[PDB]
Design an enzyme around this catalytic site. Structure first.
Site, PDB file in Angstrom:
ATOM      1  NE  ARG A  46      -0.639  -0.300   5.104  1.00 53.99           N
ATOM      2  CZ  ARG A  46       0.220   0.827   5.571  1.00 53.99           C
ATOM      3  NH1 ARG A  46      -0.224   2.077   4.915  1.00 53.99           N
ATOM      4  NH2 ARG A  46       0.517   0.574   6.738  1.00 53.99           N
ATOM      5  CE1 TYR A  49      -2.179  11.527  -3.068  1.00 60.04           C
ATOM      6  CE2 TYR A  49      -0.105  10.486  -3.547  1.00 60.04           C
ATOM      7  CZ  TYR A  49      -0.820  11.693  -3.227  1.00 60.04           C
ATOM      8  OH  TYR A  49      -0.268  12.761  -3.045  1.00 60.04           O
ATOM      9  CB  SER A  50      -3.778   3.290  -4.440  1.00 64.85           C
ATOM     10  OG  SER A  50      -2.520   3.087  -4.832  1.00 64.85           O
ATOM     11  CB  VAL A  52      -1.610  -2.622  -4.488  1.00 61.68           C
ATOM     12  CG1 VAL A  52      -1.366  -3.585  -5.744  1.00 61.68           C
ATOM     13  CG2 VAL A  52      -1.373  -1.237  -5.191  1.00 61.68           C
ATOM     14  CG  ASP A 155       5.279   9.143  -8.424  1.00 58.80           C
ATOM     15  OD1 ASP A 155       6.760   9.454  -7.805  1.00 58.80           O
ATOM     16  OD2 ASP A 155       4.655   8.573  -7.903  1.00 58.80           O
TER      17      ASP A 155
HETATM   18 BR1  LIG Z   1       2.633  -6.644  -9.987  1.00 55.19          BR
HETATM   19  C1  LIG Z   1       2.326  -5.064  -9.031  1.00 55.19           C
HETATM   20  N1  LIG Z   1       2.745  -4.794  -7.852  1.00 55.19           N
HETATM   21  C2  LIG Z   1       2.489  -3.506  -7.246  1.00 55.19           C
HETATM   22  N2  LIG Z   1       3.020  -2.924  -6.231  1.00 55.19           N
HETATM   23  N3  LIG Z   1       2.327  -1.635  -5.881  1.00 55.19           N
HETATM   24  N4  LIG Z   1       1.493  -1.416  -7.097  1.00 55.19           N
HETATM   25  C3  LIG Z   1       1.596  -2.547  -8.155  1.00 55.19           C
HETATM   26  C4  LIG Z   1       1.111  -2.798  -9.224  1.00 55.19           C
HETATM   27 BR2  LIG Z   1      -0.170  -1.714 -10.198  1.00 55.19          BR
HETATM   28  C5  LIG Z   1       1.378  -4.139  -9.867  1.00 55.19           C
HETATM   29 BR3  LIG Z   1       0.819  -4.568 -11.635  1.00 55.19          BR
END
Ligand SMILES: Brc1nc2nn[nH]c2c(Br)c1Br
Length: 334
Positions: A46, A49-50, A52, A155
């Site tokens: 994580r 902003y998000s 994952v 970024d």
């Molecule tokens: Br694989 C993968 N790993 C991530 N770690 N943070 N964001 C990610 C994304 Br988008 C992908 Br696709």
């Protein structure tokens, strides 16, 4: 007086010649799918902003990556969505597979194609001299495409580059800070990670362009070939410029300030001082000699410039002797 205006040397008016729908992301209509088509398996991490997750598409049982977006203005969600769809199918660009919203929490989420990534904290210690040139060339293919598509990533950093080392695949991810370039627009300098902010962000010069990504790329290359992570290790935004000034020297810094008539923050008055431009041999030692060469230093020197106009473009970088051997092997595989 005010700052001197600036324009990109390449892809300056590409968005102007596009239909308004291409860059007017505010009026973009989004077809929100049903997140029930995906079941979360693992949390991949994580950020700010998000958060994952690795998920499964229960319709065809294929691995996907779901990125639940943290509460930001819907304007900025459409921006990332519109950019991902404009860049869809591009070289080394992450592929947006679906756009979904939770039926209960109504929280927006993005679904991406799965990547088998090894974290750079374990991968960059193992990269050979050729692997750095190969993967840098792949990042440059992604940067040249989105720049040609009028898009500015803002970024670029190792955390946003997923590498599948077994299959030699690479994907540039996290487009939540990306923006369309329009000549004359003044942008927010509060972008990118601290250790990768270009000097234009540190001195608060808002009329920057695609060349901002090329500085961040130079910071990646510097850390990889010199085995110093990060290369410019500042304690804050102001000390970040002092770390750069202690390497690139202060003479070119104040020339850059004078050229664009940049009003320098009075905080920089006492901390910048006066420093010479150090030769790159001071950062070469027994642990990184196999990754440093006259070509790598010539290429790195052409990326890390105060003046964003004087930095290499992504296409010019791909034509540097540093990549001659990577280009040839790509040709025979062709
Ligand atoms: Br694989 C993968 N790993 C991530 N770690 N943070 N964001 C990610 C994304 Br988008 C992908 Br696709």
């Amino acid at each position: 007086s005010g700052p001197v205006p600036s324009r990109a040397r390449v892809y300056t008016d590409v968005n102007t010649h596009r239909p308004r729908e291409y860059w007017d992301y505010e009026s973009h209509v989004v077809e929100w799918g049903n997140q029930d088509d995906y079941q979360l398996v693992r949390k991949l991490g994580r950020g700010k902003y998000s958060e994952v997750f690795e998920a499964i598409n229960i319709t065809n049982n294929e691995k996907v990556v779901v990125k639940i977006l943290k509460p930001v203005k819907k304007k900025k969600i459409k921006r990332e969505i519109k950019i991902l769809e404009n860049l869809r199918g591009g070289p080394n660009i992450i592929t947006l597979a679906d756009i979904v919203k939770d039926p209960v929490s109504r929280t927006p989420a993005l679904v991406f194609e799965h990547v088998n990534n090894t974290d750079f904290k374990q991968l960059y210690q193992t990269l050979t001299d050729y692997d750095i040139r190969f993967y840098m060339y792949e990042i440059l293919k992604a940067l040249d495409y989105c720049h040609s598509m009028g898009i500015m990533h803002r970024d670029v950093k190792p955390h946003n580059v997923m590498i599948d080392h077994e299959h030699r695949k690479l994907r540039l991810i996290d487009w939540g800070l990306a923006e369309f370039y329009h000549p004359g627009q003044e942008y927010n300098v509060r972008v990118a990670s601290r250790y990768f902010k270009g000097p234009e962000l540190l001195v608060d010069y808002q009329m920057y362009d695609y060349s901002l990504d090329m500085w961040s790329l130079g910071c990646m290359l510097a850390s990889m070939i010199f085995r110093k992570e990060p290369f410019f290790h500042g304690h804050d935004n102001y000390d970040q410029l002092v770390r750069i000034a202690k390497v690139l020297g202060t003479e070119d810094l104040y020339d850059y300030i004078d050229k664009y008539n940049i009003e320098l923050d009075p905080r920089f008055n006492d901390i910048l001082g006066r420093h010479s431009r150090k030769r790159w041999e001071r950062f070469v030692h027994s642990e990184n000699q196999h990754l440093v060469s006259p070509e790598a230093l010539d290429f790195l020197d052409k990326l890390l410039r105060y003046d964003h106009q004087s930095r290499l473009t992504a296409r010019e970088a791909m034509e540097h002797p540093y990549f001659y051997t990577v280009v040839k092997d790509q040709a025979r595989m062709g």
